[PDB]
Paper text:
Patched 1, GPR161, SMO and other ciliary membrane proteins are all ferried out of cilia in a regulated manner by an evolutionarily conserved complex of eight Bardet-Biedl Syndrome (BBS) proteins, the BBSome. Our recent cryo-electron microscopy (cryo-EM) structure of the BBSome revealed that the BBSome exists mostly in an auto-inhibited, closed conformation in solution and undergoes a conformational change as it is recruited to membranes by ARL6GTP. Given that ARL6GTP triggers polymerization of a membrane-apposed BBSome/ARL6 coat and enables BBSome-mediated TZ crossing, the ARL6GTP-bound BBSome conformation represents the active form of the complex. Here we determine high-resolution structures of the BBSome alone and bound to ARL6GTP, and we map the BBSome–SMO interaction to model how the membrane-associated BBSome–ARL6GTP complex recognizes its cargoes.
Author numbering:
A (entry chain D): 425 to 479, 483 to 590
B (entry chain I): 2 to 56, 63 to 213, 234 to 397, 410 to 420, 439 to 493
C (entry chain E): 347 to 402, 408 to 424
D (entry chain F): 1 to 81, 90 to 141, 158 to 499
E (entry chain G): 6 to 212, 219 to 267, 296 to 339
F (entry chain H): 7 to 58
The structure:
């Protein structure tokens, strides 16, 4: 068989574990407690800013960028993830730096999202800076009666390769 | 501690001073004869300092004299016409000064003073850049000094006065100068990538004995001669590391992947080989057996002009001197230390406050799983629409856009507002008209 | 594992969970009796011994500790 | 003290701002001084210098629109164009993830311009692909025929034009005039002309100059340059023979052994790349490349303790990254050292200068958590990896696995579809989607997913049983 | 006497954290979490005049006190990108009586990281000013014929012909008296000068101008002798007056448990074995640990 | 002086059930020096552009 081999490192490590197992157990439990703390912290901060592209109220969105050159094709793949329930009133709003990117329609309604179909909703981003400047673009999907985004996404726009 | 340069007597050496190569010298300028060396450091700020370190402490600094003009390339050699006792050479930009550090003792550790006497001086017509010292020709018991110039010229003093001076053929930026005794040749690295060796008597008669086109210009050149079996000449470029023969061709070379700053081929071990140690700009020392790394250490600062010497009964202590003002004698750290979490029974995890915060955050999580007014007014008359927005709380990064339809066209699309104090109104006005 | 990790209260509550959630394995009862007797109680160790003997048979080393925690209690 | 002296000493100590700062003065003071002129030129060209050897970003146009390999379909084992994807993560259909990203990594090549465009910009190079791979001195004002006469000026001027301004045509003009001034007897100008050619596109015209420079004087530089040229013409076995020739010249060079190992890993026969990286170690023992590569290989072939040693070595040598500490965390956890595991991930999260590095650290923390149990912590870590890097397919796949563990089948289906859309070269999202589909039915989707799984990891086992069952249901 | 800028103490009392007379607080920052000790507990950081202090802000007992004459490197690390704001971190490396510690300070709330700058500044001010609170031999004090004064220093008494009862033949030298320190140069090869700070003086008495050091520069007894003793007792009494009026409020010239074991910079190492020669490398190397060899530690 | 007795028999799978697989832990590849220098020179230009 291909049963692995173990070197001096393994027996020294097992001897350390056999002689100092209690301290390892205690410190790993402390580290796990601190990790749960920090993960809950970051999860709550994300819920606050609503920066999760995956978040009752079922949705899933991710934005793909395609193309070099001053004009990029930005396609938002959006999807309703539910057994059988459509989502009527939703709308997408883009947040960009109006001095670097020229978005024609930075806000538009989305079609009735049928559960199970990936809707590609695309736009044409265009770099305006004569010098190569890469700035982030935010996308917020939100209801039409609410003001807090249902979910969000980020895209680091690549360099322009302009003229 | 493994692969660190563990600390020995260490110090900081002034108030934002600046040093360079040649500054750090390490010999018996005191002429005691016991073998223990003494650190000598001179900045081009002016201060010349000499130390006899002991393993911070006050009495370590032998003296801290100050000369008016800057200091370049302090050296220690037989720079006096009469006797065979080591004297200290100080090269100011337009000055040469030989001194003599005479230490008289009192009946207490700190009752002993040190006097530097101006043995002689030399007004320098040209502006000096660096120098070398050695027994030019086949003389013995004397250490002549060949100083360079910033504009190429090299002037030679026969330990007493201005012997002569000849211009280097075809050089613009002066590089590192050295003198090989097994070939009696001044070896330099011209601006045009040529490592050139000139026989001494050839320059004395004014040409090139030989040249070698290395790929770059060198930072330092250190001809080492404690081995009489096979002589070699070390040349440290700014991208490579060559060890050349005595005829002029590469004996071997290393293509360093870092940026060297200083190197010193110190005492060797095997037969024919030569141990050397080089200092990165990445704060490391590397210890090669002529091509092959035998050890590496993390230095505290960027080493400039490292040296290796016996300091207070400990042979082979490494003395480094940064260009900002640090200085440190050190010994390698050879202690592989167990990678293991520290046992600190005193330091416990405070479960109360941490559990409070975790209960708060988990409450938010398990709870979520179950400010501005806008108004538009259209004129009764290309109709002009006016949009007024008013905030309750102070808001930031406001962007207002208008979307009508494809055929209808707006005279204004986007409006950007920055921070606004609470209860502040903002009005925008645009015009919409049919186009198509 | 908690008995050898300087945490006996957690071992107590884990053994309680186990005995509540175990029905047809006397090894749990015998090991909890061993924990109790080593804790200096000797009172509830008899309760765990009686729980085991109510539950009951092949292991060579669970046989001896069965009789050694019996005779020494 | 003096201007020229202080500036030159600033140059020696690699300041590169002060040097120019004093020369600019010294040039305003005197319009006729060439020492400070070329000194400022050196400082400017060395603030930005990067050696041409390890700059091999062909991009996209070179990859398809430029054909230079003689053989079109050469024998498998003589062209550039181990652990299975069930253990080692992958980047393409094959090509398992490597240690020590270098800017010369190609790591597979696209087939068509459309595929190369419609993929992530950084899926074939360490940097996003590109279509093509006041002022101190105006290049259109100086007569290169007069600076060529003065080699002391010509060398620094060429380095300036080539590495600072990136003007290959004027650089080549200067280098040609200089080489004809030296009567073709200095290997440096030949190497520089060869570099000008190599980045103009002319490989054979560059190999000529590199060969003629090797004839003058053997140097590691020219050997590595010829190695690049030969690798560009898709000739590994010529580059290996040339490297062994160079090692015959320089008996223990580390860059040559490392190039041999890089070529052996591009050809994907690790059993010799490990030997050559071990030779590099016997020479250097601080080499980040060889140490990282042998460490990764030791980790993935179920020997995480040796990999932990190899990475603790880099920790001992002052390396302080986000990658190194996450690696130390993975090794410590999988080598069963639970005391130094999570503090390494904390240092990693601290050191991460990106949003993808943070996402990868959170992904690995979720792996730690799911190895500990407590699937909720891993759920949060995967969701945070998504929140940091939206196009993180492994996080989608693992979060869908945990969702289907909970019971939410539609969430898992959507997340696996997203993962398989982001990374088609991976096999786990396809296999899981096919598995869940077959569990509920929809044998058409199960077939369309299991076939893509077999396309991704063609030697899988469960995929074969799935395909057999499906093709049996179809009759 | 003064330890705030000379040691590194853990679990310090609520009184020793209080500003010493000569000390003065400069900047503060709340919610600075402590790391290199994985307690995950917040705190408050203080950059005082002589040392940096950190107290847990919830259990203010557990705390840290790091002196400025015991730090080697201070590094700020700007990372943890777009996911939130650019938060910083402070890495301090310390070496007290040959023991290397490292502390890390993480600014949790990314809304106030300016503190980590000022510290660096004041640390320079701590090192550029050591002639105020330390004892030095044979330094570069004298100008052409006069004394080079510190920023906050003026001379009081200018006495010529003051001997030094620690040498034999290089004695007669001027004696400068200032409000921060007292110096004596040699007036003949004027590099045998001693610059004693009032901070290091323990008691100025007569046995003759005997000056004792405060257990930090050792038991350095300094003896000087002058002309007829009238001016001598005058100088002694005025020196004692200046010493007391300084010790009232020190100057410092700064212009503008198992706790240790969890903060080692090396890792389970508070030690340095005797540095001995090494025949293998040719360098002074730390002693090897009972069976280890150089060529066995080097390979992997 | 009694030692707790441990069962000598482990849990053995008696059938292979198709379970959804997870992606595998990802060792972040290190960088070269040229790559770091190139990225820093690329971002320094951005910083100077924003700082003018």
């Amino acid at each position: 068989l291909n049963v692995p081999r173990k070197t001096r490192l393994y027996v020294d490590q097992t001897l350390r574990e056999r002689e100092a197992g209690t301290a390892m157990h205690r410190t790993f439990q402390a580290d796990l407690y601190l990790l749960r703390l920090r993960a809950a912290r970051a999860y709550v901060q994300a819920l606050e800013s609503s920066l999760s592209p995956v978040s009752r109220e079922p949705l899933k969105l991710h934005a793909v960028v395609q193309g070099l050159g001053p004009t990029f094709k930005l396609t938002l793949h959006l999807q309703n993830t539910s057994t059988a329930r459509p989502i009527l009133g939703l709308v997408v709003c883009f947040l960009y730096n109006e001095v670097l990117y020229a978005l024609p329609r930075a806000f538009f309604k989305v079609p009735l999202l049928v559960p199970g179909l990936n809707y590609p909703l695309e736009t044409f981003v265009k770099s305006l800076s004569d010098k190569g400047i890469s700035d982030i673009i935010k996308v917020l999907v939100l209801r039409e009666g609410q003001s807090t985004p249902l979910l969000s996404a980020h895209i680091n726009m690549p360099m322009s390769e302009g003229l | 501690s493994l692969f660190k340069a563990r600390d020995w007597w260490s110090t900081v050496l002034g108030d934002k001073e600046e040093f360079d190569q040649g500054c750090l010298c390490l010999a018996d300028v005191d002429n005691t004869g016991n073998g223990q060396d003494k650190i000598i450091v001179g900045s081009f700020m002016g201060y010349l300092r000499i130390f006899n370190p002991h393993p911070a402490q006050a009495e370590d600094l032998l003296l801290e004299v100050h000369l008016r003009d800057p200091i370049l390339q302090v050296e220690v050699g037989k720079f006096v016409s009469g006797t065979e006792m080591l004297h200290l050479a100080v090269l100011h930009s337009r000055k040469l000064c030989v001194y003599s550090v005479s230490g008289t003792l009192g009946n207490v550790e700190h009752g002993n003073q040190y006097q530097i006497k101006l043995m002689y001086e030399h007004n320098l017509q040209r502006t000096a850049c660096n120098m070398t010292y050695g027994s030019f020709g086949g003389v013995k018991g004397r250490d002549l000094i060949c100083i360079q110039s910033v504009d190429g010229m090299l002037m030679v003093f026969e330990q007493e006065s201005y012997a002569f001076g000849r211009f280097l053929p075809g050089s613009l930026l002066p590089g590192p100068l050295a003198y090989s005794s097994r070939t009696d040749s001044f070896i330099t690295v011209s601006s045009c990538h040529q490592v050139e060796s000139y026989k001494y008597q050839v320059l004395a008669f004014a040409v090139v004995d030989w040249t070698l086109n290395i790929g770059e210009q060198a930072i330092d050149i250190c001809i080492v001669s404690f081995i009489q079996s096979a002589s070699s000449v070390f040349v440290l470029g700014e991208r490579n590391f060559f060890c050349l023969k005595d005829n002029g061709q590469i004996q071997f070379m290393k293509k360093l992947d870092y940026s060297p700053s200083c190197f010193l081929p110190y005492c060797s071990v095997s037969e024919g080989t030569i141990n050397t140690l080089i200092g990165n700009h990445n704060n490391m020392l590397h210890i090669y057996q002529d091509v092959t790394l035998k050890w590496a250490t993390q230095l505290p600062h960027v080493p400039v002009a490292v040296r290796v010497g016996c300091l207070h009964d400990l042979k082979g202590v490494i003395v480094t001197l940064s260009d900002d003002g640090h200085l440190q004698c050190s010994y390698l750290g050879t202690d592989p230390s167990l990678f293991q979490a520290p046992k600190v029974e005193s330091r416990e995890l405070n479960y109360d406050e941490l559990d409070m915060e975790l209960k708060e955050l988990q409450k938010v999580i398990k709870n979520v799983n179950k400010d501005l007014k806008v108004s538009a007014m259209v004129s009764p008359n290309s109709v002009t629409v006016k949009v007024t927005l008013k905030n309750r709380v102070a808001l930031q990064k406001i962007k207002l856009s208008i979307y009508v339809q494809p055929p209808l066209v707006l005279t204004g699309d986007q409006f950007t507002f920055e921070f606004m104090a609470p209860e502040m109104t903002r009005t925008v006005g645009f015009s919409v008209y049919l186009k198509g | 594992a908690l008995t050898n990790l300087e945490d006996s209260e957690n071992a107590k509550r884990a053994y309680e969970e186990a005995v509540r959630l175990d029905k047809c394995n006397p090894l749990v009862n015998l090991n909890y009796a061993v924990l109790l007797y080593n804790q200096g109680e000797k009172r509830d160790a008899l309760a765990q011994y009686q729980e085991m003997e109510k539950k009951v048979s092949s292991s060579l080393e669970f046989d001896p500790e069965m009789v050694e925690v019996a005779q020494k209690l | 003290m003096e201007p020229l002296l202080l500036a030159w000493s600033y140059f020696r100590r690699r300041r590169f701002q002060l040097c120019a700062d004093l020369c600019t003065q010294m040039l305003e003071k005197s319009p006729c001084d060439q020492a400070a002129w070329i000194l400022k030129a050196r400082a400017l060209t060395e603030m930005v210098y990067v050696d041409e050897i390890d700059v091999d970003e062909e991009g996209i146009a070179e990859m398809i629109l430029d054909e230079n390999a003689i053989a079109q379909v050469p024998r498998p084992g003589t062209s550039l164009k181990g652990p299975s994807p069930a253990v080692r993560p992958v980047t393409q259909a094959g090509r398992p993830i490597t240690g020590f990203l270098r800017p010369s990594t190609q790591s597979g090549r696209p087939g068509t311009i459309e595929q190369a465009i419609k993929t992530p910009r950084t899926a074939y190079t360490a940097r996003p692909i590109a279509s093509s791979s006041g002022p101190f001195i105006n290049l259109s004002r100086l007569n290169l025929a007069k600076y060529a006469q003065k080699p002391k000026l010509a060398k620094a001027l060429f380095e300036y034009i080539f590495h600072h301004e990136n003007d290959v045509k004027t650089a080549l003009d200067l280098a040609a005039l200089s080489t004809e001034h030296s009567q073709y007897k200095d290997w440096w100008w030949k190497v520089q002309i060869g570099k000008c050619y190599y980045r103009l596109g002319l490989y054979r015209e560059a190999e000529k100059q590199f060969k003629s420079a090797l004839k003058q004087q053997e140097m590691v530089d020219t050997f590595l340059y010829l190695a690049k040229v030969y690798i560009s013409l898709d000739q590994p076995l010529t580059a290996l023979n040339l490297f062994k020739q160079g090692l015959d010249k320089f008996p223990g060079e580390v860059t040559l052994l490392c190039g041999i190992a890089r070529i052996y890993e591009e050809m994907n026969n690790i059993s010799s790349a490990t030997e050559y990286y071990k030779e590099v170690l016997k020479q250097d023992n601080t080499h980040v490349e060889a140490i990282a590569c042998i460490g990764s290989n030791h980790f993935y072939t179920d020997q995480p303790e040796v990999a932990l040693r190899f990475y603790r070595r880099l920790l001992q040598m002052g390396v302080y990254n986000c990658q190194l500490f996450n690696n130390l965390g993975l090794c410590c956890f999988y080598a069963q050292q639970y005391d130094m595991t999570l503090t390494s991930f904390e240092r990693a999260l601290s050191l991460a200068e990106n949003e993808e590095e943070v996402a990868d650290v959170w992904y690995n923390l979720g792996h730690v958590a799911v190895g500990t149990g407590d699937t909720n912590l891993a759920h949060q870590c995967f969701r945070l990896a998504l929140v940091s890097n939206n196009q993180h397919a492994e996080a989608y796949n693992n979060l869908a696995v945990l969702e289907m563990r909970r019971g939410h089948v539609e969430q898992a289906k959507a997340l696996l579809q997203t993962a398989s859309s982001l990374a088609p070269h991976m096999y786990e999202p396809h296999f899981n989607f096919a598995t869940i589909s077959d569990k509920i039915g929809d044998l058409q989707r199960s077939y369309a997913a299991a076939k893509k799984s077999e396309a991704a990891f063609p030697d899988h086992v469960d995929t074969q049983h799935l395909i057999k069952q499906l093709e049996q249901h179809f009759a | 006497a003064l330890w705030e800028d000379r040691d590194v103490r853990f679990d310090v009392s609520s009184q020793q954290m209080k500003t010493r007379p000569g000390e003065v607080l400069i900047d503060c920052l709340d919610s600075v979490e402590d790391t290199k000790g994985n307690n995950g507990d917040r705190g408050r950081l203080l950059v005082t005049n002589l040392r940096i202090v950190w107290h847990s802000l919830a259990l203010p007992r557990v705390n840290l006190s790091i002196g400025y004459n015991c730090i080697l490197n201070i590094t700020t690390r700007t990372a943890n990108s777009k996911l939130r704001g650019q938060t910083e971190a402070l890495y301090v490396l310390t070496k007290c009586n040959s023991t290397r510690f490292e502390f890390i300070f993480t600014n949790l709330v990314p809304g106030s990281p300016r503190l980590y700058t000022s510290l660096i500044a004041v640390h320079r001010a701590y090192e550029t000013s050591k002639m105020y609170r330390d004892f030095k031999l044979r330094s570069a004090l004298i100008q052409n014929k006069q004394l080079r004064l510190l920023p906050q220093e003026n001379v009081y008494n200018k006495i010529n012909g003051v001997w030094n009862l620690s040498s034999d033949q290089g004695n007669l030298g001027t004696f400068f008296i200032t409000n921060v320190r007292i110096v004596w140069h040699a007036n003949m090869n004027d590099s045998f000068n001693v610059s004693i700070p009032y901070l290091q003086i323990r008691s100025v008495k007569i046995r003759a101008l005997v000056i004792e050091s405060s257990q930090q520069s050792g038991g350095y007894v300094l003896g000087f002798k002058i002309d007829p003793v009238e001016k001598l007792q005058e100088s002694v009494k005025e020196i004692n007056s200046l010493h007391k009026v300084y010790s009232a409020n020190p100057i410092f010239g700064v212009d503008y448990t198992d706790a240790f074991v969890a903060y080692f910079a090396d890792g389970n190492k508070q030690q340095d074995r005797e540095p001995v020669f090494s025949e293998e490398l040719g360098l002074a190397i730390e002693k090897l640990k009972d069976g280890f060899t150089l060529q066995g530690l080097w390979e992997v | 002086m009694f030692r707790e007795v441990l069962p000598k028999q482990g849990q053995l799978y008696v059938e292979d059930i198709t379970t959804m697989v997870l992606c595998k832990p990802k060792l972040l590849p290190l960088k070269s020096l040229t790559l770091e220098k190139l990225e820093k020179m690329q971002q320094a230009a951005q910083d100077t552009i924003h700082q003018q």
